[PDB]
Design a protein around this nucleic acid. Structure first.
Ligand SMILES: *C[C@H]1C(=O)C2CCN1CC2
Ligand SMILES: *C[C@H]1C(=O)C2CCN1CC2
Ligand SMILES: *C[C@H]1C(=O)C2CCN1CC2
Ligand SMILES: *C[C@H]1C(=O)C2CCN1CC2
Ligand SMILES: C[C@H]1C(=O)C2CCN1CC2
Ligand SMILES: C[C@H]1C(=O)C2CCN1CC2
Ligand SMILES: [Zn+2]
Ligand SMILES: [Zn+2]
Lengths: 194, 194
DNA sequence: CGGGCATGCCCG
DNA sequence: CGGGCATGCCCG
């Protein structure tokens, strides 16, 4: 009955985890992940790679879904969408999250919650310990009429073809002009005032 | 043959001038006019009163047209429009400038230049030295996908019913959250660095 | 209200 | 590139 998808971490029986590349905090890095904050800082319309780690191999037909929700309680019931400017300038223009480099991407609009998601087949790592998906976020967190400075969580779910939830993980995202600057500011604020 | 409307001041044979109320520079004033900069600072979707002064009375049927153009050479050929966010949230939604409080307003989209303008009948001052029109600017200068931080000029023309230009004046506009702050900053910069 | 944090971006 | 100006707005 809830229209708000769950965000609670569920590593599940396959030992599903996410992982992220190390990139550092130079002012101009295109993306950078903060383990302390469990938060990706990235630039709009640029690659944001996410690694899928599993302990046990999921069954054939498993899918990987990504969906954004607002992190703050007061905004969690509002659907996360592209702002009108970037909508106008495969993926429907209203979708915030895209996957690049995949021939089997599917973009979904839920008929009951109206929430957007993007799904690709799960592929096991090559003869490697993880699989990488290249996500793109098509608005800045600050975009007026879209995210409007509100932080989001991206929820990644591993689902079998029957729709069973096999695993769930999430991470906070800030899409911004200067990921390295902003990661440094938020980590310093965590240390001084968190 | 030009698609860029003239901005050159033409006081003309009726002695046409604009005038503005004095309001000062408190951080929260809703609008404030800088004589030194010939520039109105105002807030979006709030009243921006403009006075029409004439020495001689225009003929019956005279009209008052307002149009925005970009002030900087590199942007002057681009039509000034409402941004997509405020377009979606009598006046066509794409028009930046509205007139409030007038039963005879007309909104025009030029069939050749595609430029927008808003026109009201000229009314002589009451048995007073000027007539006031209440304009509204429906985007901030900073709106993404609209003015995008580019300064505009508003061009006010006094036209007879046959279309003769009787007079023309213009003023720069900044639509912003804090007119009083921003007028003070720009006047100080004029003094220190202009 | 006024102080000052925010965050895209600097081109007259 | 990194410094710092910009400019809406501060609500976990
Ligand atoms: C943002 C992205 C990059 O450009 C490399 C470093 C960090 N992340 C993975 C690869
Ligand atoms: C973050 C900062 C940089 O280092 C370049 C990209 C965006 N911003 C301006 C230049
Ligand atoms: C912006 C507007 C106001 O609110 C009064 C002072 C200045 N201007 C005219 C009236
Ligand atoms: C300019 C400043 C003010 O004084 C109020 C209006 C907008 N901004 C925040 C509050
Ligand atoms: C998990 C991830 C790594 O750490 C490298 C790059 C691709 N996968 C295998 C080797
Ligand atoms: C010109 C203008 C003024 O200065 C006041 C207000 C209205 N008009 C007449 C009196
Ligand atoms: Zn956007
Ligand atoms: Zn706007």
């Amino acid at each position: 009955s809830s229209s708000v998808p769950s965000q609670k971490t569920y590593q599940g029986s396959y030992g599903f985890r996410l992982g992220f590349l190390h990139s550092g905090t130079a002012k101009s890095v295109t993306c950078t992940y903060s383990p302390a904050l469990n938060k990706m800082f990235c630039q709009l319309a640029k690659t944001c790679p996410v690694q899928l780690w599993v302990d046990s191999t999921p069954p054939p037909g498993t899918r990987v879904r990504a969906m954004a929700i607002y992190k703050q309680s007061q905004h969690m019931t509002e659907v996360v969408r592209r702002c009108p400017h970037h909508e106008r300038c495969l993926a429907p223009p209203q979708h915030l999250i895209r996957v690049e480099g995949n021939l089997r991407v599917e973009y979904l609009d839920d008929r009951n919650t109206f929430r957007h998601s993007v799904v690709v087949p799960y592929e096991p790592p090559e003869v490697s310990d993880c699989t990488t998906i290249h996500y793109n976020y098509m608005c800045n967190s600050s975009c007026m009429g879209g995210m409007n400075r509100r932080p989001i969580l991206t929820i990644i779910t591993l689902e079998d073809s029957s729709g069973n939830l096999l695993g769930r993980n999430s991470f906070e995202v800030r899409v911004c002009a200067c990921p390295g600057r902003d990661r440094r500011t938020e980590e310093e604020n965590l240390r001084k005032k968190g």
